[PDB]
Structure formats: structure tokens, C-alpha cells
Design a protein around this ligand. Structure first.
Ligand SMILES: CC(C)(C)c1cc(NC(=O)CSc2nnnn2-c2ccc(O)cc2)n(-c2ccccc2)n1
Length: 297
């Protein structure tokens, strides 16, 4: 509560709504006197929907976590606004939205119409995809370092910004645009089953090793340009396939070495999976490698 930075309401000017959840409305806003170099900048502002009693504590833990967890590929948190209501959380605005939307909007069958400023026309090339994957991996190295377990790693939970800087976040399981990416158990609990390893589905254990599995699935989302994992399957069919040891096929756009990295994440025994530090190293080696090398994959 003391560690969390505070922003005066007068310094925040709401412009329009960006999105909406069950836990809050997100707005694009101007924030004044937040930084030295920038006299005025753009921010995402989550206004708390104070309906339930516990939402105020979730707000608090979110703001506390995001004040502690800060890194180049984690969503940037600037502080809260507690003076008056509704309570506001203030974030760095990422102009391309979520990585899933971005991947789909530069998929295959994308002509010269897509592109400009920070991305080329049409389908993202191998270098761009490896760049995306390396950044996410870097963010997961950091969380792995602090022994944080994400539990909902997926492209829909990654933001993309100016110059394709990618940062990991977590936007609840609240937005209805991605409700089919969860399996509703009974009432209110939602499970991202298609991203989950067999030990998480069967035994309900979430660890650093279950995140690496999920990164593996993010790597497949990236190389399928935002395709849902197991899109051909219903939820229960997916649970069956994942628990019975079935693996997602190599995507068309994905070369063998990168599929090898995915398979590294998908070892059935958690112990046998490669560390996120190794995966990042491999991807960044690939991301930064010269054109001559990459053209031969
Ligand atoms: C870092 C970690 C993965 C642990 C994480 C991140 C978050 N939180 C986020 O990622 C909210 S980002 C966000 N929220 N509202 N709007 N918005 C938004 C919209 C568009 C933009 O361009 C920019 C921002 N958590 C977390 C922790 C506890 C409870 C809930 C979430 N954990």
C-alpha cells in the first residue's frame, strides 16, 4: 500500500473506452506529469467496478504485484488513483492491443493492406515471429527467476506496442472475446485447458514447469498466427487429447528447430522439460541470427 505509487485524479484525462470486463472498464487517457522527458503521454486506465466486496482487495493485490514485478517484457504499471471514486489503475498503453489480435491481423492471406509504422506488409516473417517469441520467453525467464507462476499464459494475455515490443500481462479471464479459450467448470471457475499440461488438468498442480508447457503452446499460437490450440476439438475432447499424451502438429510457418523447442516444453514428465532460460536462449539466438542462417532453417 505504501510501495504502490499514486497518481492524482486531476493529472488523468479519460479520452474513450478501450475495453470492458466484469472487474473493470479500461479507458485510454492522457496522464500529466508522470515522466520527465514526456510532458504528456497516453495510458490505459482501469476503472474498478466496485460491485463485490472482494474486488477492492484484488485491485490492491494486482497493484502490489505489478509494483513488485517490473521488467522490460512485463506490462508497465505506473500506479493507482485512490483519491475519489472509482478507483483507477494506470498502465502503459500498448497501441497494437493483445498479441493474439495482432497475430491474426498479420496472418497468412494478408496482403499489402496490413503493415506500416512498425510491421511489414502481410504475413509476419520468421524473424518477426522469433522476435515475438523471444520477448515473451524473456518475460517468463523473469517470472521464473522470482518463482512466480503465471497460470494463464497465452497470446491474448500478451500486449504489443510501438516497434513490436511485447510484454506479458494477465487480463483476468473476464473478457468475453476469449470466453471459448476457457472451460467453465460448474459456476464461476474458468480453466484455460487448451494451454494446460496433463498434470494441471489431472492433478490440478500449477508450477514453473506448467508455465513452460504453456509457453510451448504460446510458441505454437505465434507460428499459427493466433490459431486456437486444438481448435478442431471441443473442450472435453481437448482434455482427453492432452491427458492421453497427444501433441499439437508442426505449423506450416514453423521450421523444425523451433518445433524442437516446442517439443522441449511438452515433455510429459515436468522434470524432463527444458527450463525457460534455455528456451529463451535458443529463441534469441534464432531471433538475432543473420539472414543467411535463418533462410536455411
Ligand atoms: C505481470 C503479471 C503477468 C504477473 C500480471 C499482470 C497483471 N495485470 C495486467 O496485465 C493488467 S493490464 C490492464 N488491465 N486493465 N487494463 N489493462 C490494459 C489494457 C490495455 C493496455 O494497452 C494496457 C493495459 N496481473 C494481475 C495480477 C493480479 C490480478 C489481475 C491481474 N499479473
Amino acid at each position: 500500500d505504501a510501495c504502490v505509487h499514486h497518481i492524482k485524479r486531476r493529472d488523468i484525462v479519460l479520452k474513450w473506452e478501450l475495453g470492458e470486463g466484469a472487474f473493470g472498464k479500461v479507458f485510454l487517457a492522457e496522464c500529466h506529469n508522470l515522466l520527465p522527458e514526456q510532458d504528456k503521454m497516453l495510458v490505459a486506465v482501469k476503472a474498478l467496478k466496485e460491485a463485490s466486496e472482494s474486488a477492492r482487495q484484488d485491485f490492491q493485490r494486482e497493484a502490489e504485484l505489478l509494483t513488485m514485478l517490473q521488467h522490460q517484457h512485463i506490462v508497465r504499471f505506473f500506479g493507482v488513483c485512490t483519491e475519489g471514486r472509482p478507483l483507477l489503475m494506470v498502465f502503459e498503453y500498448m497501441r497494437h492491443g493483445d498479441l493474439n489480435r495482432f497475430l491474426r491481423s498479420h496472418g497468412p492471406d494478408a496482403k499489402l493492406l496490413a503493415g506500416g509504422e512498425d510491421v511489414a506488409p502481410g504475413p509476419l516473417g520468421l524473424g518477426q515471429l522469433l522476435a515475438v517469441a523471444s520477448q515473451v520467453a524473456a518475460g517468463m525467464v523473469y517470472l521464473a527467476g522470482l518463482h512466480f507462476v503465471h497460470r494463464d499464459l497465452a497470446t491474448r494475455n500478451c500486449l504489443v506496442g510501438q516497434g513490436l515490443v511485447v510484454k506479458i500481462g494477465d487480463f483476468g479471464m473476464s473478457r468475453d472475446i476469449y470466453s471459448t479459450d476457457y472451460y467453465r467448470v460448474g459456476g464461476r471457475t474458468m480453466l484455460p485447458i487448451r494451454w494446460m499440461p496433463p498434470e494441471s488438468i489431472l492433478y490440478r498442480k500449477f508450477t514453473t514447469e506448467s508455465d513452460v508447457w504453456s509457453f510451448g503452446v504460446v510458441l505454437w499460437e505465434i507460428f499459427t498466427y493466433g490459431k486456437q490450440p486444438w481448435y478442431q476439438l471441443s473442450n472435453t475432447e481437448a482434455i482427453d487429447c492432452i491427458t492421453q499424451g497427444r501433441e499439437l502438429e508442426r505449423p506450416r510457418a514453423c521450421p523444425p528447430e523451433v518445433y524442437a523447442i516446442m517439443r522441449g516444453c511438452w515433455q510429459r514428465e515436468p522434470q524432463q522439460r527444458h527450463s525457460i532460460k534455455d528456451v529463451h536462449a535458443r529463441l534469441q539466438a534464432l531471433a538475432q541470427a543473420p539472414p543467411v542462417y535463418l533462410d536455411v532453417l
